[PDB]
Amino acid sequence: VQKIGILGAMREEITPILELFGVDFEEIPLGGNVFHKGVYHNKEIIVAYSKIGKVHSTLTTTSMILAFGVQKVLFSGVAGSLVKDLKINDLLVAIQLVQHDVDLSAFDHPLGFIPESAIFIETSESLNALAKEVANEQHIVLKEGVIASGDQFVHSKERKEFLVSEFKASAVEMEGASVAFVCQKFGVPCCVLRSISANADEEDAFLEKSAQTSAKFLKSMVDEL
Amino acid sequence: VQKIGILGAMREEITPILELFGVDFEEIPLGGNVFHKGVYHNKEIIVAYSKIGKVHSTLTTTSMILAFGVQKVLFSGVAGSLVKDLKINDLLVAIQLVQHDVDLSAFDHPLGFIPESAIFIETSESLNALAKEVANEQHIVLKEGVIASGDQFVHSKERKEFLVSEFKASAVEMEGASVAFVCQKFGVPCCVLRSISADAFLEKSAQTSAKFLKSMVDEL
């Protein structure tokens, strides 16, 4: 029985996901999270809001995997662009991610690095390839890049410039890296998709449209699994 | 069947705990961690190191609870002092913990606050009182205070003074708050104990902490 996890990074991103799949979803409370469980064409689909920041999103992902047995994870949301050519409404697949706020440079480690780990987190080759195929089929341009995540909102010119110089990041948000990290640790293929909600020089109804567009893209992925 | 989780931040702290409990531990890999499962006087003891930082420690704690059913968590480690009265080798129990690096101030949230949470995370009355009781019986001084945790190793005067001024923290490390938070979310009692550190120091400190943890478990 195939079991697929779907995360969104705002509560309001969940509604159009559950609506579009169209089946009944049972609400299961666990660890202060609510997981929505439904059956769609003989796959179990487990949908949750991550909650904010890395500790929340780690907890929700680890829970999803251990309590519900999800075998693959798709994580949708929005991100702010760090690069001129990545603009509002562009869709981005995260080929790698980084925890941009990790700093053990006092022990001469490169920024982003933790011992017994690595700076960059890898996502699923097969799921990213699937996202490319779906984007081709649906006539949606799909860009690729590195997403930086950290437990601060990044707004300053200096901090955005640091993300690009240090990590070659394309976009920034708060929960992607941690989710991808957990998945990788459990051998669970993960795909992290972001649509751009702010241009690189910048810091609601528009997020309602993005959340609908994302739900459509997620369903078109699941329809291929 | 009582199930107790014992967490250390780093590998060298585990070794002495496994040896002192003395029982046969089964090694169970899960989520890139190795959990050591043993039965000690009719209590199941699950021992693991987190690895460093908030993601790692949140992952490990959640696994302890969901995969192994632990009912109570004891977390031991070292921490750096932020106040003159906490000196090297002092033992501190964390009454509250904060994630000091969380900053949603761009949206007028206080520093350390995340929506659906709180700035300060609480720990177990009962387990804290047990730590105090063990310490009193053995004539070991046990200090109490707030622990600040974050994904940076804090070394500057400016950041240390920020921790004191913003959170009234007494000590700083990288994993306490995330472990305590996970336990709170699952209604699992948690005790966070830290020896003040500022390789050879660490060996002694791990042996003495293993003895203190064993002493607590003997009362549970």
Number of helices of chain A: 6
Largest interface, counted with CB-CB under 8 A?
A-B, 36 and 36 residues
Q: Give, in spatial order, the strands making up the sheet with the most strands of chain A.
A: 6-10-9-7-11
Regarding quaternary structure, what we see is homodimer
State the CATH topology of chain A.
Rossmann fold
User: What is the approximate shape of chain A?
Assistant: globular
CATH first level of chain A: which class?
Alpha Beta
State the helicity of chain A in percent bands.
Answer: 25-40%
The secondary-structure element order of chain A is: EHEEEHEEEEHEHEHEH
Task: Provide the gyration radius of chain A in Å.
Answer: 17 Å
Strand content of chain A: 25-35%
Total DSSP E strands of chain A: 11
Distance between the termini of chain A: 12 Å
Enzyme class (chain A): hydrolase
InterPro entries (chain A): MTA_SAH_Nsdase, Nucleoside_phosphorylase_d, Nucleoside_phosphorylase_sf
Keywords (chain A): Amino-acid biosynthesis, Hydrolase, Menaquinone biosynthesis, Methionine biosynthesis
GO molecular function (chain A): 6-amino-6-deoxyfutalosine hydrolase activity; adenosylhomocysteine nucleosidase activity; methylthioadenosine nucleosidase activity
Strands, helices and their partners?
Two copies of one chain form a homodimer.
Chain A: E1 2-8, H1 11-21, E2 25-30, E3 33-40, E4 43-49, H2 53-68, E5 72-76, E6 78-81, E7 91-99, E8 120-122, H3 125-138, E9 142-149, H4 157-167, E10 171-173, H5 176-186, E11 190-198, H6 205-222
Parallel strand pairs in A: 1-4, 1-5, 5-11, 6-11, 7-9, 9-10
Antiparallel strand pairs in A: 2-3, 3-4, 6-10, 7-8, 7-11
GO molecular function (chain B): 6-amino-6-deoxyfutalosine hydrolase activity; adenosylhomocysteine nucleosidase activity; methylthioadenosine nucleosidase activity
Pfam families (chain B): PNP_UDP_1
Protein name (chain B): Aminodeoxyfutalosine nucleosidase
